[PDB]
Amino acid sequence: EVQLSESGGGFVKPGGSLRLSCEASGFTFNNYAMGWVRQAPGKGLEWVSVTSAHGGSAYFGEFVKGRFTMSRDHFIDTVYLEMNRLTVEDTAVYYCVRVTFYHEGSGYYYRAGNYFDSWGQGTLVIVSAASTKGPSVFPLAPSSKSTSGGTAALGCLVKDYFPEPVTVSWNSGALTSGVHTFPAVLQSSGLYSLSSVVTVPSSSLGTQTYICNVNHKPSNTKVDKKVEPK
Amino acid sequence: DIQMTQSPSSLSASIGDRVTITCRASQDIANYLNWYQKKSGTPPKLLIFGATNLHHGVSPRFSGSGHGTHFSLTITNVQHEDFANYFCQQSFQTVGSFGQGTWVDIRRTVAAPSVFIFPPSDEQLKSGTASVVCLLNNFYPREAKVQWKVDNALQSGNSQESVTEQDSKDSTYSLSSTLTLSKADYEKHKVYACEVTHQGLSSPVTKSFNRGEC
Amino acid sequence: VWKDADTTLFCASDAKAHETEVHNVWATHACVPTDPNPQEIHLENVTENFNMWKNNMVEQMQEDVISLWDQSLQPCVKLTGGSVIKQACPKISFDPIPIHYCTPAGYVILKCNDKNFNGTGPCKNVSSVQCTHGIKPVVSTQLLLNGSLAEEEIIIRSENLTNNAKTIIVHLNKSVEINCTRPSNGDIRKAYCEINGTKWNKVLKQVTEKLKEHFNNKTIIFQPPSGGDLEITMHHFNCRGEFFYCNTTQLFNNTCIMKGCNGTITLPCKIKQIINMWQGTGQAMYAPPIDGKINCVSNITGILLTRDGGANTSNETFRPGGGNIKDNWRSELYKYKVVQI
Ligand SMILES: *[C@@H]1O[C@H](CO)[C@@H](O)[C@H](O)[C@H]1NC(C)=O
Ligand SMILES: *[C@@H]1O[C@H](CO)[C@@H](O)[C@H](O)[C@H]1NC(C)=O
Ligand SMILES: *[C@@H]1O[C@H](CO)[C@@H](O)[C@H](O)[C@H]1NC(C)=O
Ligand SMILES: *[C@@H]1O[C@H](CO)[C@@H](O)[C@H](O)[C@H]1NC(C)=O
Ligand SMILES: *[C@@H]1O[C@H](CO)[C@@H](O)[C@H](O)[C@H]1NC(C)=O
Ligand SMILES: *[C@@H]1O[C@H](CO)[C@@H](O)[C@H](O)[C@H]1NC(C)=O
Ligand SMILES: *[C@@H]1O[C@H](CO)[C@@H](O)[C@H](O)[C@H]1NC(C)=O
Ligand SMILES: *[C@@H]1O[C@H](CO)[C@@H](O)[C@H](O)[C@H]1NC(C)=O
Ligand SMILES: *[C@@H]1O[C@H](CO)[C@@H](O)[C@H](O)[C@H]1NC(C)=O
Ligand SMILES: *[C@@H]1O[C@H](CO)[C@@H](O)[C@H](O)[C@H]1NC(C)=O
């Protein structure tokens, strides 16, 4: 059974270099072309690179522009992707893929007409100049003009933290229904910002206490913020 | 060099439906086209290769067709596991390339968003920054437009948004949008409005507040 | 009585001890002299099954040619994965000679003599031989050079012709000369191959008609390879020790399958210092070409093709292939198999 295992993921400064590796097993490594495919946050799959079975040739997606290098080690059935002069736009999950040709007969040579039959689990590369930072938590107070006899919304704004993730519960996990914790957005500052909201009966405001429990492990930050009306 | 364009951008389906995704290449690529499935948390999965060949282990509910520039993926008898993002890929040139993707979500009754606007907390304003948040809660379909207005001036470039995954129970989405201004610029204006456009609304809904108000 | 079997064959040749030509040097040590009077005998009423695509004779020849090239065309610089091998790379004499493959005592080679034998299945006119015919270990892609010709009709060979994944070997019954030249005294790497467009197109038409027999009279189209390594997108071969890369776009030109294109086809070629090794061992770097006229005239005796396929379509599209050099040896060893007494 084919197995592809990536490693070398992590953080790197823009303009910096980072080498990914893919350890292959369950098939004859020397017979197959190998490659890489990535998916950046909020974007689609992107053809990064493929190297021939013989390992003397490699080809790259248009965005690479001479920045990347591939190599393979037949002694340990490993493929490498050296990435240089990385940018924030290169932040993505990178997948190791095995390449199968539509047609037999090319031997060790790479030919057009192929498909990515097997995929690794992927490894995350984050290209950032930011340093570890804990979030500021601000209340999203329920509107005083909240609908009478209806439903009100309140939440917590988790702003300016790095890296991902943060975790958010309400009332220490007591309140779960109606909770929406949104995906973080990457701000121009290079820091992430996230919101968590919950809808509740407007009648419960001024009687019911609502605390959001924010946890950011990288900075070992644990915050509790009571969200009161007005 | 070769651009792959998928259509539609997205579509909804019920269990048991048949749906078709199309892929167009900017030039002839013979049958050198593959289809992949992508679901969050797992890597891409090959479905179809060489335009028409079903990959080993893949359900025959998936089939591919086309030759030249126009291709299609058909999913018969849609199952819950099929709700995913789908990508075409040409392998005709030495360097291959992917389509932009087409995602399939679960059809439900149209639901307009419950809209809420939150002013920046005094706590944050003390830091010299003002974040104005607008919530669009539990709506369907996913398409929604948020338009920030400050003193009725249409904003742009100073907001970001994100959307939840389709809810497993009620099949709805929620959206949060954040307008970020300096404290200076925030104090400099009065009315802050969040204008929401959605299929479920007869006309755009606006929620707003005046800076100095309880 | 006998049975199918695999054994370590030995080779024979007419190599000369005085030659510095590298094939002669290898064969002088590796092979025995040929039999000036070899023993072939018809087998009265014997039907034997052959399978060219599963013939271990091919594997042994592959190993020999790799061995020969290791000793003969060692690069100045070899790059394999994460290592750099430097070795002396003097210019040498290079011109393939025929190699015969022979069975040891206790074995014999059965030879298929059916005039249109396609490479697989039963053969009715069978004979037994001591050794194969003389096979030149010519390494090339797309076009099979300096080989043997089919005796009767053009033969289409494939493990499974309905499976488009399987490679196609077209065996010609009339050869077409390809005249490749790097002329002497701008670019020392610029070369070209000349073919009689009249001879070629007529053969290509015959190949077309033969392919129609197998594919329900469908329209047969030829197209260049859409992409990949240069060694298989181009006609790759070695002439006088120099590695040639020739563009065969003009050879697979459907317009001439009646516009006046009966003239000389001049394929543009390039001699490269850096090559991807057919042996699968990374890339190799050689010194720039020798001075003077570099010339090789060869017989095109076969063609390697891949079929696009397509689920229904009105056409069948074929593109020149190759790269797996084992298939080169298959195109000659197809009618032989080893058996044990
Ligand atoms: C079998 O074919 C060979 C040539 O391929 C020929 O010499 C021989 O005569 C044939 N067999 C008979 C019985 O004629
Ligand atoms: C070759 O001949 C055998 C025996 O008749 C047949 O089974 C096979 O289909 C043929 N293949 C081709 C490509 O002609
Ligand atoms: C080669 O074979 C074709 C049929 O494939 C036939 O029409 C032609 O006459 C043959 N030519 C020679 C020289 O045997
Ligand atoms: C030949 O290929 C066809 C199509 O791929 C396939 O249906 C058939 O089973 C193959 N024949 C054999 C003997 O494998
Ligand atoms: C090959 O081409 C060269 C230059 O075009 C010519 O001088 C030579 O005579 C040709 N050889 C043959 C055998 O046609
Ligand atoms: C090509 O070969 C034909 C023989 O079929 C011959 O008549 C013609 O003159 C050749 N072309 C040349 C010599 O340019
Ligand atoms: C071969 O020649 C054709 C026509 O000039 C050209 O389009 C093609 O790119 C060439 N092939 C290579 C590998 O340069
Ligand atoms: C085919 O040959 C004709 C000669 O009339 C030429 O004009 C055309 O460009 C050729 N097409 C190719 C080489 O693709
Ligand atoms: C084919 O054989 C001829 C004559 O022996 C020779 O001049 C030519 O170089 C050979 N071609 C190749 C590719 O070895
Ligand atoms: C190669 O072609 C030449 C010229 O027609 C011919 O004299 C020679 O016999 C051919 N050799 C083979 C092995 O077909």
CSV table of N, CA, C and O in Angstrom, one decimal, chain B residues 59-148:
chain,number,residue,atom,x,y,z
B,59,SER,N,-16.1,5.3,-6.3
B,59,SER,CA,-17.5,4.9,-6.6
B,59,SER,C,-17.8,5.2,-8.1
B,59,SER,O,-17.6,6.2,-8.6
B,60,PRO,N,-18.5,4.2,-8.8
B,60,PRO,CA,-18.9,4.4,-10.2
B,60,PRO,C,-20.0,5.4,-10.3
B,60,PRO,O,-20.5,5.6,-11.4
B,61,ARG,N,-20.5,6.0,-9.2
B,61,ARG,CA,-21.4,7.1,-9.3
B,61,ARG,C,-20.7,8.3,-9.9
B,61,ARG,O,-21.4,9.2,-10.4
B,62,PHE,N,-19.4,8.3,-9.9
B,62,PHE,CA,-18.6,9.3,-10.6
B,62,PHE,C,-18.3,8.9,-12.0
B,62,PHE,O,-17.8,7.8,-12.2
B,63,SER,N,-18.5,9.8,-13.0
B,63,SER,CA,-18.1,9.5,-14.3
B,63,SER,C,-17.6,10.8,-15.0
B,63,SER,O,-18.1,11.9,-14.7
B,64,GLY,N,-16.6,10.7,-15.9
B,64,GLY,CA,-16.1,11.8,-16.6
B,64,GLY,C,-16.3,11.7,-18.1
B,64,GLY,O,-16.5,10.6,-18.6
B,65,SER,N,-16.4,12.8,-18.8
B,65,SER,CA,-16.6,12.8,-20.3
B,65,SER,C,-15.9,14.1,-20.8
B,65,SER,O,-15.6,15.0,-20.1
B,66,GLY,N,-15.8,14.1,-22.2
B,66,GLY,CA,-15.2,15.2,-22.9
B,66,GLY,C,-13.9,14.9,-23.5
B,66,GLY,O,-13.2,14.0,-23.2
B,67,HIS,N,-13.6,15.7,-24.6
B,67,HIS,CA,-12.4,15.5,-25.4
B,67,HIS,C,-12.1,16.8,-26.1
B,67,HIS,O,-13.0,17.3,-26.9
B,68,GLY,N,-11.0,17.4,-26.0
B,68,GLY,CA,-10.6,18.6,-26.6
B,68,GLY,C,-10.5,19.8,-25.6
B,68,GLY,O,-9.4,20.0,-25.0
B,69,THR,N,-11.6,20.5,-25.4
B,69,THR,CA,-11.6,21.7,-24.6
B,69,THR,C,-12.7,21.6,-23.5
B,69,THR,O,-12.5,22.2,-22.4
B,70,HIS,N,-13.8,20.9,-23.8
B,70,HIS,CA,-14.9,20.9,-22.9
B,70,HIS,C,-15.0,19.5,-22.2
B,70,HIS,O,-15.1,18.5,-22.9
B,71,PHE,N,-15.1,19.5,-20.9
B,71,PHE,CA,-15.1,18.3,-20.1
B,71,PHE,C,-16.2,18.5,-19.0
B,71,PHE,O,-16.6,19.6,-18.7
B,72,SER,N,-16.6,17.3,-18.5
B,72,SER,CA,-17.6,17.3,-17.4
B,72,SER,C,-17.4,16.2,-16.5
B,72,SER,O,-17.0,15.1,-16.9
B,73,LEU,N,-17.7,16.5,-15.2
B,73,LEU,CA,-17.8,15.4,-14.2
B,73,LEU,C,-19.2,15.3,-13.7
B,73,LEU,O,-19.9,16.3,-13.4
B,74,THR,N,-19.8,14.1,-13.8
B,74,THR,CA,-21.1,13.8,-13.4
B,74,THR,C,-21.1,13.0,-12.1
B,74,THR,O,-20.5,11.9,-12.0
B,75,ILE,N,-21.9,13.4,-11.1
B,75,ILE,CA,-22.1,12.6,-9.9
B,75,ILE,C,-23.6,12.2,-9.9
B,75,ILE,O,-24.5,13.0,-9.7
B,76,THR,N,-23.8,10.9,-10.0
B,76,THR,CA,-25.1,10.3,-9.9
B,76,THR,C,-25.4,9.8,-8.5
B,76,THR,O,-24.5,9.3,-7.8
B,77,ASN,N,-26.7,10.0,-8.1
B,77,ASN,CA,-27.1,9.6,-6.8
B,77,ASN,C,-26.3,10.1,-5.7
B,77,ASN,O,-25.6,9.4,-4.9
B,78,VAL,N,-26.2,11.4,-5.6
B,78,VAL,CA,-25.4,12.2,-4.7
B,78,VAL,C,-25.5,11.6,-3.3
B,78,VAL,O,-26.7,11.4,-2.8
B,79,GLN,N,-24.4,11.3,-2.6
B,79,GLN,CA,-24.4,10.9,-1.2
B,79,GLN,C,-23.7,12.0,-0.4
B,79,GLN,O,-23.1,12.9,-0.9
B,80,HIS,N,-23.9,11.9,1.0
B,80,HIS,CA,-23.4,12.9,1.9
B,80,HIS,C,-21.9,13.1,1.7
B,80,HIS,O,-21.4,14.3,1.9
B,81,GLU,N,-21.2,12.1,1.4
B,81,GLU,CA,-19.8,12.1,1.3
B,81,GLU,C,-19.3,12.9,0.1
B,81,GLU,O,-18.1,13.3,0.0
B,82,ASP,N,-20.2,13.2,-0.8
B,82,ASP,CA,-19.9,13.8,-2.1
B,82,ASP,C,-19.9,15.4,-2.0
B,82,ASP,O,-19.4,16.1,-2.8
B,83,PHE,N,-20.4,15.9,-0.9
B,83,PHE,CA,-20.4,17.3,-0.6
B,83,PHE,C,-19.0,17.7,-0.4
B,83,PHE,O,-18.5,17.4,0.7
B,84,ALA,N,-18.4,18.4,-1.3
B,84,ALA,CA,-17.0,18.7,-1.3
B,84,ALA,C,-16.7,19.7,-2.4
B,84,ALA,O,-17.5,20.2,-3.1
B,85,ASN,N,-15.4,20.0,-2.5
B,85,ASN,CA,-14.8,20.8,-3.6
B,85,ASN,C,-14.2,19.9,-4.6
B,85,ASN,O,-13.6,19.0,-4.3
B,86,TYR,N,-14.5,20.3,-5.9
B,86,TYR,CA,-14.0,19.4,-7.0
B,86,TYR,C,-13.1,20.2,-8.0
B,86,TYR,O,-13.5,21.4,-8.3
B,87,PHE,N,-12.0,19.6,-8.4
B,87,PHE,CA,-11.0,20.3,-9.2
B,87,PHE,C,-10.7,19.5,-10.5
B,87,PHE,O,-10.5,18.3,-10.4
B,88,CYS,N,-10.7,20.2,-11.6
B,88,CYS,CA,-10.2,19.6,-12.8
B,88,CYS,C,-8.7,19.9,-12.9
B,88,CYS,O,-8.2,20.8,-12.3
B,89,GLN,N,-8.0,19.2,-13.8
B,89,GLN,CA,-6.6,19.4,-13.9
B,89,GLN,C,-6.1,18.8,-15.3
B,89,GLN,O,-6.3,17.7,-15.6
B,90,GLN,N,-5.5,19.7,-16.1
B,90,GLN,CA,-4.9,19.3,-17.3
B,90,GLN,C,-3.4,18.8,-17.1
B,90,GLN,O,-2.7,19.3,-16.2
B,91,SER,N,-3.0,17.8,-17.8
B,91,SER,CA,-1.7,17.2,-17.8
B,91,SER,C,-1.1,17.2,-19.2
B,91,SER,O,-0.1,16.5,-19.4
B,92,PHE,N,-1.7,18.0,-20.1
B,92,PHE,CA,-1.3,17.9,-21.5
B,92,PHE,C,0.0,18.5,-21.7
B,92,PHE,O,0.8,18.0,-22.5
B,93,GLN,N,0.3,19.7,-21.1
B,93,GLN,CA,1.6,20.3,-21.2
B,93,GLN,C,2.5,19.7,-20.1
B,93,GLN,O,2.1,19.1,-19.2
B,94,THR,N,3.8,19.8,-20.3
B,94,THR,CA,4.8,19.4,-19.4
B,94,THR,C,4.5,19.8,-18.0
B,94,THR,O,4.4,18.9,-17.1
B,95,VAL,N,4.2,21.0,-17.8
B,95,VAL,CA,3.6,21.5,-16.5
B,95,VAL,C,2.1,21.5,-16.6
B,95,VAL,O,1.5,22.2,-17.5
B,96,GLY,N,1.5,20.8,-15.7
B,96,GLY,CA,0.0,20.7,-15.6
B,96,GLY,C,-0.5,21.9,-14.9
B,96,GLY,O,0.2,22.8,-14.4
B,97,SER,N,-1.8,22.0,-14.8
B,97,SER,CA,-2.5,23.1,-14.1
B,97,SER,C,-3.9,22.7,-13.7
B,97,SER,O,-4.6,21.9,-14.3
B,98,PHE,N,-4.4,23.3,-12.6
B,98,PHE,CA,-5.7,23.0,-12.0
B,98,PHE,C,-6.8,24.0,-12.4
B,98,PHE,O,-6.5,25.2,-12.6
B,99,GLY,N,-8.0,23.6,-12.4
B,99,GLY,CA,-9.2,24.5,-12.4
B,99,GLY,C,-9.3,25.2,-11.1
B,99,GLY,O,-8.6,24.8,-10.1
B,100,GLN,N,-10.1,26.2,-11.0
B,100,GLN,CA,-10.3,27.0,-9.8
B,100,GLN,C,-11.1,26.3,-8.7
B,100,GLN,O,-11.2,26.8,-7.6
B,101,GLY,N,-11.8,25.3,-9.1
B,101,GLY,CA,-12.6,24.5,-8.2
B,101,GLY,C,-14.1,24.8,-8.3
B,101,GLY,O,-14.5,25.9,-8.7
B,102,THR,N,-14.9,23.8,-8.0
B,102,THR,CA,-16.3,23.9,-7.9
B,102,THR,C,-16.8,23.1,-6.7
B,102,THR,O,-16.6,21.9,-6.6
B,103,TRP,N,-17.5,23.8,-5.7
B,103,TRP,CA,-17.9,23.1,-4.5
B,103,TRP,C,-19.4,22.8,-4.6
B,103,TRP,O,-20.2,23.6,-5.1
B,104,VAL,N,-19.8,21.7,-4.0
B,104,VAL,CA,-21.2,21.2,-3.9
B,104,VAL,C,-21.6,21.2,-2.4
B,104,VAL,O,-20.9,20.5,-1.6
B,105,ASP,N,-22.6,21.9,-2.1
B,105,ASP,CA,-23.1,21.9,-0.7
B,105,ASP,C,-24.6,21.4,-0.7
B,105,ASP,O,-25.1,21.0,-1.7
B,106,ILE,N,-25.1,21.3,0.5
B,106,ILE,CA,-26.4,20.6,0.8
B,106,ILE,C,-27.5,21.6,0.6
B,106,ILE,O,-27.6,22.7,1.2
B,107,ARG,N,-28.5,21.3,-0.3
B,107,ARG,CA,-29.6,22.2,-0.6
B,107,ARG,C,-30.5,22.2,0.6
B,107,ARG,O,-30.8,21.2,1.3
B,108,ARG,N,-31.0,23.4,1.0
B,108,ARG,CA,-32.1,23.5,1.9
B,108,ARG,C,-33.0,24.7,1.5
B,108,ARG,O,-32.7,25.4,0.5
B,109,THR,N,-34.1,25.0,2.2
B,109,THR,CA,-34.9,26.1,1.9
B,109,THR,C,-34.1,27.4,2.1
B,109,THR,O,-33.3,27.5,3.0
B,110,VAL,N,-34.4,28.4,1.2
B,110,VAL,CA,-33.7,29.7,1.3
B,110,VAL,C,-34.0,30.3,2.7
B,110,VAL,O,-35.2,30.3,3.1
B,111,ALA,N,-33.0,30.7,3.4
B,111,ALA,CA,-33.1,31.4,4.6
B,111,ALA,C,-32.3,32.7,4.6
B,111,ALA,O,-31.1,32.7,4.4
B,112,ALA,N,-33.0,33.8,4.8
B,112,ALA,CA,-32.4,35.1,4.9
B,112,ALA,C,-31.5,35.2,6.2
B,112,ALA,O,-31.9,34.5,7.2
B,113,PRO,N,-30.5,36.0,6.2
B,113,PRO,CA,-29.7,36.2,7.4
B,113,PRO,C,-30.3,37.1,8.4
B,113,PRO,O,-30.9,38.1,8.1
B,114,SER,N,-30.2,36.7,9.7
B,114,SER,CA,-30.4,37.6,10.8
B,114,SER,C,-29.2,38.5,11.0
B,114,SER,O,-28.1,38.0,11.2
B,115,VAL,N,-29.4,39.8,10.8
B,115,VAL,CA,-28.2,40.7,10.7
B,115,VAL,C,-28.0,41.5,12.0
B,115,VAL,O,-29.0,42.0,12.6
B,116,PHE,N,-26.8,41.6,12.5
B,116,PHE,CA,-26.4,42.3,13.7
B,116,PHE,C,-25.2,43.2,13.4
B,116,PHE,O,-24.3,42.8,12.7
B,117,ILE,N,-25.1,44.4,14.0
B,117,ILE,CA,-24.0,45.2,14.0
B,117,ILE,C,-23.5,45.5,15.4
B,117,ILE,O,-24.3,45.8,16.3
B,118,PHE,N,-22.2,45.5,15.6
B,118,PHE,CA,-21.6,45.8,16.9
B,118,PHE,C,-20.6,46.9,16.8
B,118,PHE,O,-19.7,46.9,15.9
B,119,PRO,N,-20.7,48.0,17.6
B,119,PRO,CA,-19.7,49.0,17.6
B,119,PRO,C,-18.4,48.6,18.3
B,119,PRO,O,-18.4,47.6,19.0
B,120,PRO,N,-17.3,49.3,18.1
B,120,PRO,CA,-16.1,49.0,18.8
B,120,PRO,C,-16.2,49.3,20.3
B,120,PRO,O,-16.8,50.2,20.7
B,121,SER,N,-15.6,48.4,21.1
B,121,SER,CA,-15.7,48.6,22.6
B,121,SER,C,-14.8,49.7,23.0
B,121,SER,O,-13.7,50.0,22.3
B,122,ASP,N,-15.1,50.4,24.0
B,122,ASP,CA,-14.3,51.5,24.6
B,122,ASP,C,-12.9,50.9,25.0
B,122,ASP,O,-11.9,51.6,24.9
B,123,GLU,N,-12.9,49.7,25.4
B,123,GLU,CA,-11.7,49.0,25.7
B,123,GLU,C,-10.7,48.9,24.6
B,123,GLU,O,-9.5,49.1,24.8
B,124,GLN,N,-11.2,48.7,23.4
B,124,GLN,CA,-10.4,48.7,22.2
B,124,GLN,C,-10.0,50.1,21.7
B,124,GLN,O,-8.9,50.4,21.4
B,125,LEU,N,-11.0,51.0,21.8
B,125,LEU,CA,-10.8,52.4,21.4
B,125,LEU,C,-9.7,53.0,22.2
B,125,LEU,O,-9.0,54.0,21.7
B,126,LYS,N,-9.4,52.5,23.4
B,126,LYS,CA,-8.4,53.0,24.2
B,126,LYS,C,-7.0,52.6,23.7
B,126,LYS,O,-6.0,53.3,24.0
B,127,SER,N,-7.0,51.6,22.8
B,127,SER,CA,-5.7,51.2,22.2
B,127,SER,C,-5.5,51.9,20.8
B,127,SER,O,-4.4,51.7,20.2
B,128,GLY,N,-6.4,52.8,20.4
B,128,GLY,CA,-6.2,53.6,19.2
B,128,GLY,C,-6.8,52.9,18.0
B,128,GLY,O,-6.5,53.4,16.9
B,129,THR,N,-7.5,51.8,18.2
B,129,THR,CA,-8.1,51.1,17.0
B,129,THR,C,-9.6,50.9,17.2
B,129,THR,O,-10.0,50.7,18.4
B,130,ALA,N,-10.3,50.9,16.1
B,130,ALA,CA,-11.7,50.6,16.2
B,130,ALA,C,-12.1,49.6,15.2
B,130,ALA,O,-11.9,49.7,14.0
B,131,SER,N,-12.7,48.5,15.7
B,131,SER,CA,-13.2,47.4,14.9
B,131,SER,C,-14.7,47.3,15.0
B,131,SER,O,-15.3,47.1,16.0
B,132,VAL,N,-15.4,47.5,13.8
B,132,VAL,CA,-16.8,47.5,13.7
B,132,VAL,C,-17.2,46.1,13.1
B,132,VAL,O,-16.8,45.8,12.0
B,133,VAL,N,-18.0,45.3,13.8
B,133,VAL,CA,-18.3,44.0,13.4
B,133,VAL,C,-19.8,43.9,13.0
B,133,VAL,O,-20.7,44.4,13.6
B,134,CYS,N,-20.0,43.2,11.8
B,134,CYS,CA,-21.3,42.9,11.3
B,134,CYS,C,-21.5,41.4,11.2
B,134,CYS,O,-20.7,40.7,10.5
B,135,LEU,N,-22.6,40.8,11.8
B,135,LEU,CA,-22.9,39.4,11.8
B,135,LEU,C,-24.1,39.1,10.9
B,135,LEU,O,-25.1,39.7,11.1
B,136,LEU,N,-23.9,38.2,10.0
B,136,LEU,CA,-25.0,37.6,9.2
B,136,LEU,C,-25.2,36.2,9.6
B,136,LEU,O,-24.3,35.3,9.4
B,137,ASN,N,-26.3,35.9,10.3
B,137,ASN,CA,-26.4,34.6,11.0
B,137,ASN,C,-27.4,33.6,10.3
B,137,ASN,O,-28.6,34.0,10.0
B,138,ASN,N,-27.0,32.4,10.1
B,138,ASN,CA,-27.8,31.3,9.7
B,138,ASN,C,-28.6,31.6,8.4
B,138,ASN,O,-29.9,31.6,8.5
B,139,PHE,N,-27.9,31.7,7.3
B,139,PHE,CA,-28.6,32.0,6.0
B,139,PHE,C,-28.2,30.9,5.0
B,139,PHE,O,-27.3,30.1,5.2
B,140,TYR,N,-29.0,30.9,3.9
B,140,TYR,CA,-28.8,30.0,2.8
B,140,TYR,C,-29.5,30.5,1.6
B,140,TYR,O,-30.7,30.9,1.7
B,141,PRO,N,-28.9,30.5,0.4
B,141,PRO,CA,-27.5,30.0,0.1
B,141,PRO,C,-26.4,30.8,0.6
B,141,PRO,O,-26.6,31.8,1.3
B,142,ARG,N,-25.1,30.4,0.3
B,142,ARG,CA,-23.9,31.0,0.8
B,142,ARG,C,-23.6,32.4,0.3
B,142,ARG,O,-23.0,33.2,1.0
B,143,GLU,N,-24.1,32.7,-0.9
B,143,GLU,CA,-23.8,34.0,-1.5
B,143,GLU,C,-24.4,35.1,-0.7
B,143,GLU,O,-25.6,35.1,-0.4
B,144,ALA,N,-23.6,36.1,-0.3
B,144,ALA,CA,-24.1,37.2,0.5
B,144,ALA,C,-23.1,38.4,0.3
B,144,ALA,O,-21.9,38.1,0.2
B,145,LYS,N,-23.6,39.6,0.2
B,145,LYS,CA,-22.8,40.8,0.1
B,145,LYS,C,-23.0,41.7,1.2
B,145,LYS,O,-24.1,42.1,1.6
B,146,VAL,N,-21.8,42.0,1.9
B,146,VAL,CA,-21.8,43.0,2.9
B,146,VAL,C,-21.2,44.3,2.4
B,146,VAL,O,-20.1,44.3,1.8
B,147,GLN,N,-21.9,45.4,2.6
B,147,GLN,CA,-21.4,46.7,2.2
B,147,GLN,C,-21.4,47.7,3.4
B,147,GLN,O,-22.5,48.1,3.9
B,148,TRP,N,-20.2,48.0,3.8
B,148,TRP,CA,-20.0,49.0,4.9
B,148,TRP,C,-20.2,50.4,4.4
B,148,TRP,O,-19.8,50.8,3.3
